Design a protein around this ligand. Sequence first.
Ligand SMILES: *[C@@H]1O[C@H](CO)[C@@H](O[C@@H]2O[C@H](CO)[C@@H](O[C@@H]3O[C@H](CO)[C@@H](O)[C@H](O)[C@@H]3O)[C@H](O)[C@H]2NC(C)=O)[C@H](O)[C@H]1NC(C)=O
Ligand SMILES: *[C@@H]1O[C@H](CO)[C@@H](O[C@@H]2O[C@H](CO)[C@@H](O)[C@H](O)[C@H]2NC(C)=O)[C@H](O)[C@H]1NC(C)=O
Ligand SMILES: *[C@@H]1O[C@H](CO)[C@@H](O)[C@H](O)[C@H]1NC(C)=O
Ligand SMILES: *[C@@H]1O[C@H](CO)[C@@H](O)[C@H](O)[C@H]1NC(C)=O
Ligand SMILES: *[C@@H]1O[C@H](CO)[C@@H](O)[C@H](O)[C@H]1NC(C)=O
Ligand SMILES: [Zn+2]
Lengths: 595, 96
Amino acid sequence: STTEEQAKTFLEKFNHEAEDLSYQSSLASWNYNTNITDENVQKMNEARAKWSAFYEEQSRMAKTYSLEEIQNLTLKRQLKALQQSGTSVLSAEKSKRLNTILNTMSTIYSTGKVLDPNTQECLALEPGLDDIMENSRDYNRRLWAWEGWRAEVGKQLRPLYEEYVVLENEMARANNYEDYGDYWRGDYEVTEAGDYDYSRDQLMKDVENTFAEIKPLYEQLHAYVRAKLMDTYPSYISPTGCLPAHLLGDMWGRFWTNLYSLTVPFKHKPSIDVTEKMKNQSWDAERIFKEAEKFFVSISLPHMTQGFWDNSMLTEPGDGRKVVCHPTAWDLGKGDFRIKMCTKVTMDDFLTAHHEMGHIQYDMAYAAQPYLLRDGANEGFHEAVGEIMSLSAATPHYLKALGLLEPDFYEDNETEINFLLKQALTIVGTLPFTYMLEKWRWMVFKGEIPKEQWMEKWWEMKREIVGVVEPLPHDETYCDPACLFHVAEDYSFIRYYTRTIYQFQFHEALCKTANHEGALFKCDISNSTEAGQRLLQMLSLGKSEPWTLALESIVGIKTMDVKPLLNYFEPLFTWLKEQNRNSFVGWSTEWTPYS
Amino acid sequence: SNKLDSKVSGNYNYLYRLFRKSNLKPFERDISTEIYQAGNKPCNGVAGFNCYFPLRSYSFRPTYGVGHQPYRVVVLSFELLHAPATVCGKKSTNLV
Ligand SMILES: *[C@@H]1O[C@H](CO)[C@@H](O[C@@H]2O[C@H](CO)[C@@H](O[C@@H]3O[C@H](CO)[C@@H](O)[C@H](O)[C@@H]3O)[C@H](O)[C@H]2NC(C)=O)[C@H](O)[C@H]1NC(C)=O
Ligand SMILES: *[C@@H]1O[C@H](CO)[C@@H](O[C@@H]2O[C@H](CO)[C@@H](O)[C@H](O)[C@H]2NC(C)=O)[C@H](O)[C@H]1NC(C)=O
Ligand SMILES: *[C@@H]1O[C@H](CO)[C@@H](O)[C@H](O)[C@H]1NC(C)=O
Ligand SMILES: *[C@@H]1O[C@H](CO)[C@@H](O)[C@H](O)[C@H]1NC(C)=O
Ligand SMILES: *[C@@H]1O[C@H](CO)[C@@H](O)[C@H](O)[C@H]1NC(C)=O
Ligand SMILES: [Zn+2]
């Protein structure tokens, strides 16, 4: 009679095998990275290959149904997620043409090639392509590295860019969807929720105010860099224009600390480095993980230590076999804790270790959710919760509580603003970079921009907001724009841009709800229990509900707000205003050294 | 009993029911070998739509979580009837 029993029977049967295969497929990758042998490749690659073929059989009949005759809104959400088509309807013939673009593109970008004119002298393997661009303070050396890393690497990527786009236009019509642009915007879709739904049209207005209101601070940061380096490098800097692309340090430009010694915010006071004393005290490497853990118990959860401290290694390769120790902490499955990291005694790595195992605390709470809804509310929440406390526990004031700081420490405010500045600039470094990339892609799929403008339009949007210009114009044979991050590596950035605004939101949500008073930039959550009880409210909610409900419970806002951001750096903003009371905060994008 | 009832490659012997017609009467067993059906259209031997096999394996492993380790259970039930109480628990002190 009722067709619901068919839906109920499918849901349980699919989950039981999938999570078993999810554990099995995962261990093949995790074991391979801990133990790299060719016999492990066979286990690793076959388990990936066999899982997908079985998955499709279950997913084909899974989406054979739809959101019909399901009065349960929660079950309807679970079904809605599994019913995504993707490549299920994609034909095999068009798939193959895509594989050629993908496999070649990644391999050819890693091998950077830079011509070394005049042959120099007898040369060894050294120096290396990565190293040469980072240490070069000479004008010719920096440009010589940069020109090769742009011109001679973009050439190989040009043939692969256009073929990938052509298929993007074609596959849309065979996948019952208009264009790829809706897919990325539909990631935050809420459907069939009265007085509570969220729409893709809303983000366009909200993101407009974020950049406009942050821009005055970024303009000061842009002016700050130029004014200080004007004294050291006046010849290679235009006071009435943009800045040469070679001065960013590297292709990415996310790291401004390479020339930190030439742009120290306060050189009058010597370097703040007081952790050397702790280095010779010979503390164990595993204590750092406990330091985060004992922080976590403060919010009144029990401890975790039995059966999840054996599957890991610290400080030692363990054999003549080599292990990659990139930071990759995933609970393999069914509560199996695992963390691979080269844990070393370092102030910077101290917060990193907090971040790494703090990822597990997220996973442990939501591990009870069924298979199809077991993850965080949005992409950027995960890394945010790890970072907010790691920065809080890495503050020198907290060092006093744990006794790490010197007993004779006198209250300093010069040190605080310097740390926040480097913390600020790294985050805001690439927001305008991804801003032009994310917005430019959307109108590409619309179809009002033809193929010819893939050179000028990419540069035009960048100059409007970012202000980066190549010193020498490059013709169409030369391929500068090809080095974008979504074709060169095809890694999603959506976990990064919207994360930062979520990070301020999570940072502000904890403090204001915990009766916190004083400075906004410093917040204390150790020795409190109210925050964690509210924390667990969505730390274990999961995706059984849209993220909108959790947003209203913790704070009470269903939209994204930027106003608190100005209060965060109130002491910092004063110093920036004081130093630039004479110069003009801004630049002319239209002026060029050529003309 | 994780240290003895768990196999590294897997313990697929242990099997538990997942689907049946209706609720069980207390103290009843369900060993009937029958494949569940929805609508009676699918027949035995061909299970492509709506037909599944309700007995799934626990698949115990030593690397699982505390709640995913096997925990043997022993249940005692006491019955008093019109019988002369043939089962009982009696300390006796030394005589003087
Ligand atoms: C969270 O709060 C607890 C309870 O206050 C802290 O434990 C206690 O912290 C103090 C301060 O470091 C430790 O030193 C004690 O100081 C008092 C103050 O004069 C002194 O009378 C004692 O003789 C002692 O030296 C104390 O040993 C420690 N434990 C207890 C049981 O009081 C805890 O440190 C706080 N944690 C954080 C992260 O704030
Ligand atoms: C890394 O993996 C290889 C498998 O490719 C391991 O070599 C096997 O080890 C097991 C148990 O030690 C033996 O029973 C096999 O005979 C070994 N060879 C093969 C081909 O499987 C190797 O021992 C692993 N590394 C470490 C440190 O244990
Ligand atoms: C909907 O499904 C959930 C399962 O999580 C259940 O708790 C709830 O009672 C169901 N509600 C209705 C109206 O069926
Ligand atoms: C560690 O170094 C500090 C300063 O560098 C000094 O007190 C001493 O050399 C070491 N401290 C010890 C051994 O307690
Ligand atoms: C800077 O911090 C110190 C810390 O003691 C204190 O004087 C005050 O909070 C700040 N001083 C300013 C902003 O002039
Ligand atoms: Zn991380």
